[PDB]
Amino acid sequence: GSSGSSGVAVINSAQDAPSEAPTEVGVKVLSSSEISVHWEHVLEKIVESYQIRYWAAHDKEEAANRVQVTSQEYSARLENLLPDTQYFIEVGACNSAGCGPPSDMIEAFTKKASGPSSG
């Protein structure tokens, strides 16, 4: 109903912060509920890990899951997804010190889930 910012005034303290984003990021659809998320390591070795968010077209970025994998893993893996469903993925590196900007918004398309259906 009502909101008053008046020039956000927050005091934060950090040693370093990410300024570069992981380019050349692409997602590969392994299976109906399996998908791999690769990305290029940022020039910032300060980043603790990479947060790979993923959600359905209907879902909201706020309700989107989060996958934090060791900064060593050039790529990640997604599970527990829906078949033939659009999923907005995004890879963004960041450390416990400062937060970094998200990478380009990419969309994924899982495959159709098959079953024992005989006829």
PDB file of C-alpha atoms in Angstrom:
ATOM      1  CA  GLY A   1       0.000   0.000   0.000  1.00  0.00           C
ATOM      2  CA  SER A   2       2.659   2.503   1.041  1.00  0.00           C
ATOM      3  CA  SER A   3       6.427   2.639   0.532  1.00  0.00           C
ATOM      4  CA  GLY A   4       9.074   5.185   1.473  1.00  0.00           C
ATOM      5  CA  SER A   5      12.703   4.832   0.411  1.00  0.00           C
ATOM      6  CA  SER A   6      14.075   8.360   0.776  1.00  0.00           C
ATOM      7  CA  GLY A   7      17.436   7.350  -0.656  1.00  0.00           C
ATOM      8  CA  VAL A   8      18.251   3.851   0.571  1.00  0.00           C
ATOM      9  CA  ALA A   9      20.718   4.264   3.435  1.00  0.00           C
ATOM     10  CA  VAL A  10      22.407   0.956   4.256  1.00  0.00           C
ATOM     11  CA  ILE A  11      25.871   0.458   5.742  1.00  0.00           C
ATOM     12  CA  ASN A  12      27.699  -2.590   4.389  1.00  0.00           C
ATOM     13  CA  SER A  13      31.259  -3.842   4.874  1.00  0.00           C
ATOM     14  CA  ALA A  14      33.184  -6.112   2.507  1.00  0.00           C
ATOM     15  CA  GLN A  15      36.756  -6.782   1.383  1.00  0.00           C
ATOM     16  CA  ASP A  16      36.034  -7.352  -2.307  1.00  0.00           C
ATOM     17  CA  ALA A  17      33.165  -7.608  -4.791  1.00  0.00           C
ATOM     18  CA  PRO A  18      32.493  -9.111  -8.245  1.00  0.00           C
ATOM     19  CA  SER A  19      32.444  -6.674 -11.165  1.00  0.00           C
ATOM     20  CA  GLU A  20      32.670  -9.059 -14.119  1.00  0.00           C
ATOM     21  CA  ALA A  21      29.936 -11.454 -15.238  1.00  0.00           C
ATOM     22  CA  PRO A  22      30.372 -14.995 -16.623  1.00  0.00           C
ATOM     23  CA  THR A  23      30.018 -14.709 -20.399  1.00  0.00           C
ATOM     24  CA  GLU A  24      29.591 -17.482 -22.967  1.00  0.00           C
ATOM     25  CA  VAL A  25      27.058 -19.160 -20.676  1.00  0.00           C
ATOM     26  CA  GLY A  26      24.977 -21.970 -22.142  1.00  0.00           C
ATOM     27  CA  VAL A  27      22.657 -24.702 -20.889  1.00  0.00           C
ATOM     28  CA  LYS A  28      22.460 -28.231 -22.292  1.00  0.00           C
ATOM     29  CA  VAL A  29      19.324 -30.362 -21.987  1.00  0.00           C
ATOM     30  CA  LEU A  30      20.534 -33.784 -20.854  1.00  0.00           C
ATOM     31  CA  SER A  31      17.189 -35.418 -20.070  1.00  0.00           C
ATOM     32  CA  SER A  32      13.532 -34.570 -19.463  1.00  0.00           C
ATOM     33  CA  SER A  33      14.395 -33.757 -15.849  1.00  0.00           C
ATOM     34  CA  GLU A  34      18.143 -33.355 -16.355  1.00  0.00           C
ATOM     35  CA  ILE A  35      20.037 -30.279 -17.547  1.00  0.00           C
ATOM     36  CA  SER A  36      23.621 -29.012 -17.405  1.00  0.00           C
ATOM     37  CA  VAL A  37      24.637 -25.382 -16.893  1.00  0.00           C
ATOM     38  CA  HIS A  38      28.098 -24.353 -18.091  1.00  0.00           C
ATOM     39  CA  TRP A  39      29.810 -20.966 -17.849  1.00  0.00           C
ATOM     40  CA  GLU A  40      33.172 -19.208 -18.126  1.00  0.00           C
ATOM     41  CA  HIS A  41      35.057 -18.553 -14.886  1.00  0.00           C
ATOM     42  CA  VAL A  42      35.056 -14.831 -14.098  1.00  0.00           C
ATOM     43  CA  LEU A  43      38.347 -12.940 -13.865  1.00  0.00           C
ATOM     44  CA  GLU A  44      37.437 -12.420 -10.209  1.00  0.00           C
ATOM     45  CA  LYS A  45      38.961 -15.197  -8.102  1.00  0.00           C
ATOM     46  CA  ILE A  46      37.197 -13.654  -5.108  1.00  0.00           C
ATOM     47  CA  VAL A  47      33.880 -15.268  -6.034  1.00  0.00           C
ATOM     48  CA  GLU A  48      33.008 -18.045  -3.586  1.00  0.00           C
ATOM     49  CA  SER A  49      30.629 -19.935  -5.876  1.00  0.00           C
ATOM     50  CA  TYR A  50      28.119 -19.602  -8.714  1.00  0.00           C
ATOM     51  CA  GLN A  51      24.375 -19.420  -8.070  1.00  0.00           C
ATOM     52  CA  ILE A  52      22.365 -21.113 -10.818  1.00  0.00           C
ATOM     53  CA  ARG A  53      18.693 -20.161 -10.548  1.00  0.00           C
ATOM     54  CA  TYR A  54      16.019 -22.075 -12.461  1.00  0.00           C
ATOM     55  CA  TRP A  55      12.225 -21.887 -12.613  1.00  0.00           C
ATOM     56  CA  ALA A  56       9.244 -22.428 -14.910  1.00  0.00           C
ATOM     57  CA  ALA A  57       7.928 -19.703 -17.215  1.00  0.00           C
ATOM     58  CA  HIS A  58       4.966 -19.333 -14.857  1.00  0.00           C
ATOM     59  CA  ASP A  59       7.072 -19.403 -11.690  1.00  0.00           C
ATOM     60  CA  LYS A  60       8.625 -16.171 -10.417  1.00  0.00           C
ATOM     61  CA  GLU A  61      12.293 -15.260  -9.988  1.00  0.00           C
ATOM     62  CA  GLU A  62      11.511 -14.911  -6.281  1.00  0.00           C
ATOM     63  CA  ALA A  63      10.240 -18.493  -6.137  1.00  0.00           C
ATOM     64  CA  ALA A  64      13.033 -19.783  -8.372  1.00  0.00           C
ATOM     65  CA  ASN A  65      15.263 -22.488  -6.896  1.00  0.00           C
ATOM     66  CA  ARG A  66      18.965 -21.899  -6.249  1.00  0.00           C
ATOM     67  CA  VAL A  67      21.968 -24.104  -7.017  1.00  0.00           C
ATOM     68  CA  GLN A  68      25.255 -23.039  -5.429  1.00  0.00           C
ATOM     69  CA  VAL A  69      28.174 -25.149  -6.654  1.00  0.00           C
ATOM     70  CA  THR A  70      31.881 -24.841  -5.868  1.00  0.00           C
ATOM     71  CA  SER A  71      33.512 -22.080  -7.913  1.00  0.00           C
ATOM     72  CA  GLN A  72      35.734 -24.898  -9.174  1.00  0.00           C
ATOM     73  CA  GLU A  73      32.871 -26.568 -11.038  1.00  0.00           C
ATOM     74  CA  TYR A  74      33.012 -24.959 -14.481  1.00  0.00           C
ATOM     75  CA  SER A  75      29.434 -26.206 -14.823  1.00  0.00           C
ATOM     76  CA  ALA A  76      26.474 -27.414 -12.763  1.00  0.00           C
ATOM     77  CA  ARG A  77      23.615 -29.913 -12.958  1.00  0.00           C
ATOM     78  CA  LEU A  78      19.858 -29.514 -12.506  1.00  0.00           C
ATOM     79  CA  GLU A  79      17.404 -32.189 -11.368  1.00  0.00           C
ATOM     80  CA  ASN A  80      13.757 -32.566 -10.353  1.00  0.00           C
ATOM     81  CA  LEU A  81      12.465 -30.640 -13.369  1.00  0.00           C
ATOM     82  CA  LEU A  82       9.360 -30.939 -15.546  1.00  0.00           C
ATOM     83  CA  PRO A  83       9.238 -32.591 -18.995  1.00  0.00           C
ATOM     84  CA  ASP A  84       8.747 -30.432 -22.088  1.00  0.00           C
ATOM     85  CA  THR A  85       8.644 -27.323 -19.898  1.00  0.00           C
ATOM     86  CA  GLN A  86      10.314 -23.937 -20.356  1.00  0.00           C
ATOM     87  CA  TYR A  87      12.782 -23.150 -17.572  1.00  0.00           C
ATOM     88  CA  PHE A  88      14.546 -19.802 -17.203  1.00  0.00           C
ATOM     89  CA  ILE A  89      18.128 -20.438 -16.093  1.00  0.00           C
ATOM     90  CA  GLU A  90      20.742 -17.907 -14.986  1.00  0.00           C
ATOM     91  CA  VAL A  91      24.339 -18.273 -13.806  1.00  0.00           C
ATOM     92  CA  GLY A  92      25.717 -15.588 -11.511  1.00  0.00           C
ATOM     93  CA  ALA A  93      28.934 -15.661  -9.497  1.00  0.00           C
ATOM     94  CA  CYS A  94      29.239 -13.962  -6.108  1.00  0.00           C
ATOM     95  CA  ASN A  95      31.138 -14.164  -2.817  1.00  0.00           C
ATOM     96  CA  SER A  96      30.084 -13.887   0.827  1.00  0.00           C
ATOM     97  CA  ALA A  97      31.525 -10.369   0.717  1.00  0.00           C
ATOM     98  CA  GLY A  98      29.825  -8.555  -2.146  1.00  0.00           C
ATOM     99  CA  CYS A  99      27.007  -9.578  -4.476  1.00  0.00           C
ATOM    100  CA  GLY A 100      27.482  -9.655  -8.236  1.00  0.00           C
ATOM    101  CA  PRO A 101      25.153  -8.949 -11.181  1.00  0.00           C
ATOM    102  CA  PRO A 102      23.327 -11.863 -12.858  1.00  0.00           C
ATOM    103  CA  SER A 103      24.304 -13.134 -16.308  1.00  0.00           C
ATOM    104  CA  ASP A 104      22.230 -13.047 -19.495  1.00  0.00           C
ATOM    105  CA  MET A 105      18.749 -14.552 -19.203  1.00  0.00           C
ATOM    106  CA  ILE A 106      18.610 -17.879 -21.041  1.00  0.00           C
ATOM    107  CA  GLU A 107      15.673 -20.235 -21.572  1.00  0.00           C
ATOM    108  CA  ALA A 108      15.752 -24.038 -21.591  1.00  0.00           C
ATOM    109  CA  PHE A 109      13.357 -26.611 -23.045  1.00  0.00           C
ATOM    110  CA  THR A 110      13.309 -30.081 -21.488  1.00  0.00           C
ATOM    111  CA  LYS A 111      12.326 -33.182 -23.458  1.00  0.00           C
ATOM    112  CA  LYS A 112       9.054 -35.120 -23.359  1.00  0.00           C
ATOM    113  CA  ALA A 113       8.841 -37.616 -20.496  1.00  0.00           C
ATOM    114  CA  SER A 114       8.086 -41.121 -21.767  1.00  0.00           C
ATOM    115  CA  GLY A 115       6.416 -43.939 -19.858  1.00  0.00           C
ATOM    116  CA  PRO A 116       5.343 -47.604 -19.970  1.00  0.00           C
ATOM    117  CA  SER A 117       2.344 -46.494 -22.030  1.00  0.00           C
ATOM    118  CA  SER A 118       1.859 -49.446 -24.381  1.00  0.00           C
ATOM    119  CA  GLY A 119      -1.433 -48.542 -26.031  1.00  0.00           C
TER     120      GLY A 119
END
